[PDB]
Design a protein around this ligand. Sequence first.
Ligand SMILES: O=c1ccn([C@@H]2O[C@H](COP(=O)(O)OP(=O)(O)O[C@H]3O[C@H](CO)[C@@H](O)[C@H](O)[C@H]3O)[C@@H](O)[C@H]2O)c(=O)[nH]1
Ligand SMILES: O=c1ccn([C@@H]2O[C@H](COP(=O)(O)OP(=O)(O)O)[C@@H](O)[C@H]2O)c(=O)[nH]1
Ligand SMILES: [Ca+2]
Ligand SMILES: [Mn+2]
Lengths: 123, 272
Amino acid sequence: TELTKCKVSHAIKDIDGYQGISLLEWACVLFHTSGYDTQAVVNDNGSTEYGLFQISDRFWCKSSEFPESENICGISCDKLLDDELDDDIACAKKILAIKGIDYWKAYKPMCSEKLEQWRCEKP
Amino acid sequence: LTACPEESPLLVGPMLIEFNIPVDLKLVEQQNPKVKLGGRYTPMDCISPHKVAIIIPFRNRQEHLKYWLYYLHPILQRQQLDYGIYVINQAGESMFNRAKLLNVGFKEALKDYDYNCFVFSDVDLIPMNDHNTYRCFSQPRHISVAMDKFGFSLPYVQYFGGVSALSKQQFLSINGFPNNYWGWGGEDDDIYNRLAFRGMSVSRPNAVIGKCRMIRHSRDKKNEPNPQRFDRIAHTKETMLSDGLNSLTYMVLEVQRYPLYTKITVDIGTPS
Ligand SMILES: O=c1ccn([C@@H]2O[C@H](COP(=O)(O)OP(=O)(O)O[C@H]3O[C@H](CO)[C@@H](O)[C@H](O)[C@H]3O)[C@@H](O)[C@H]2O)c(=O)[nH]1
Ligand SMILES: O=c1ccn([C@@H]2O[C@H](COP(=O)(O)OP(=O)(O)O)[C@@H](O)[C@H]2O)c(=O)[nH]1
Ligand SMILES: [Ca+2]
Ligand SMILES: [Mn+2]
């Protein structure tokens, strides 16, 4: 489900500020990470990244093809492909606390500057 | 024998763009009798200062090309450009390489005519207003500014994908585009970086005359998201000195001249 800056911004409120990242930065990171698509699925190196946040099945969620994974977030990866962002957010929160914002590789190169353009301009 | 006016008197402004009614290239050659073998057109009324090679990165997108040709040919003429159409068809089945093909388009089109301007255009983008001129400006020009795909908004100020135009010099100044981006994403961001690291800024038509339609389509096999893009994009400054025009290698497999365009099939290697 292709969301929009503002939709993302409103569904993502609870994560604002956590580990010091604002909603401007998340909007920017999320656009470059999954084009705001909650059903985004991408391969990398023998692993898959799921949903809006592109959480990896390598260590964070359980995928049927990786029952070995640490599943640090304790959730089935498929739960990151629906349109309920609560669990995606809680998992993103764990990643932030443990590995940090650098898990999202688009952050440094694409979201280090010019953040005002990422604000949602709709009430 | 007098130069073409700065703004073409033939312009129509906003236009209806849709992809439902099938097109017949034969009907298109029909409607566009001035386009000569290879997809070349030169105004016979005035003398355009814009010798433009339009370069389209290509692989299995003939249906999109049909619409592209149908819509753009009338437009480019309305814009009084001395233009040539180049479709750079990637031969083979390994990962798609957009920027590298663009690089090839540059060298190949130059073999034909002494173009001074280069418009790189993807196959699925149709401008919705003919005031959005396909020519070069005092600074690199980003053309596909407001895509229906993005709500008729620039997705981010640093965006340079879709359709852009660089003069021969502007292009030469950045060692051209990079050849090392295999798969989808980031090459356009890298190109963006190359411009800044060379003192160029981006010129754009405003969001209204920059309205554009991208034929709806799903991501193609062999053009999956490049997992390395974000890291490669962080080093543009150094890599642009060693990856570009000066490191380009490719083999021409076939040069085809149809009435509405020139398609060049090339072997550009593999991700290494
Ligand atoms: O199998 C393929 C894959 C790609 N292409 C060509 O490559 C361009 C880009 O691929 P596509 O999937 O259509 O890209 P998008 O994701 O739709 O388009 C935008 O986003 C990419 C990422 O920003 C850009 O770099 C493009 O330039 C920009 O127009 C296409 O339009 C074609 O011209 C082919 O011809 N065949
Ligand atoms: O100006 C043109 C260009 C193309 N065609 C038609 O479009 C086909 C091209 O198909 P494609 O590019 O897929 O050919 P291939 O490269 O695979 O030979 C031609 O054979 C013609 O029937 C045409 O009628 N007029
Ligand atoms: Ca969910
Ligand atoms: Mn496209």
